[PDB]
């Protein structure tokens, strides 16, 4: 197994996967680590499973059919892996805790978002479809964008913007188009 955390990069107390060489922190992990379990699967080999199982899943989807899904299982899985995937880049650390708005001439974001809200709400199951998930994640950019206007730190959501979206259209199948 690695020595590093597959989210964060550091090493401390981790857990390793019996299915694959990743390791996590016990809370960089979503779902935070299960107590017992041996062996233990981490959530990259337990949406590989989902594939391997129903191999037709990775047919191109339409994004408007996606997000209708109902939160069943899998697709709460599902989301719960991609909001890994954006805590995997290190510029996530922007968007992860509660923001505040306090800059000359921009007004804060009637709704403010935030990934730890977003990795709340999962695990309390407040999203009954992929579009409840898929939204708050998408407000956390557009929130960013609007703020800082034009200053160069718009670009920040921007990139971790496009960490969301790649990583959609792969996790979900999402129909490749130009
Ligand atoms: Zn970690
Ligand atoms: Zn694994
Ligand atoms: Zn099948």
New binding site residues.
């Given amino acids: 197994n690695s020595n590093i955390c597959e989210v964060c990069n550091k090493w401390g107390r981790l857990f390793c ?1 019996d ?2 060489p ?1 390791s996590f922190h016990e809370h960089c992990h979503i779902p935070s680590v299960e107590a017992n379990k041996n062996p233990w ?2 959530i ?2 337990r949406i590989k499973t989902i594939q391997e199982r129903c191999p037709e899943s990775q047919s191109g989807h339409q994004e408007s059919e996606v997000l209708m899904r109902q939160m069943l299982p899998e697709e709460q899985l599902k989301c719960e892996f991609l909001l890994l995937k954006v805590y995997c880049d290190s510029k996530s650390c922007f968007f992860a805790s509660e923001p505040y708005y306090n800059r000359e001439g921009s007004q804060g974001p009637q709704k403010p978002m935030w990934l730890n809200k977003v990795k709340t709400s999962l695990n309390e199951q407040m999203y009954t479809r992929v579009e409840g998930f898929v939204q708050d994640m998408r407000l956390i950019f557009h929130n960013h964008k609007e703020f800082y206007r034009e200053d160069k730190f718009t670009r920040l959501g921007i990139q971790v913007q496009d960490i969301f979206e790649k990583n959609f259209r792969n996790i979900f199948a999402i129909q490749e188009t130009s």
């Fill in positions: 996967c299915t694959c990743r699967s981490c990259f080999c």
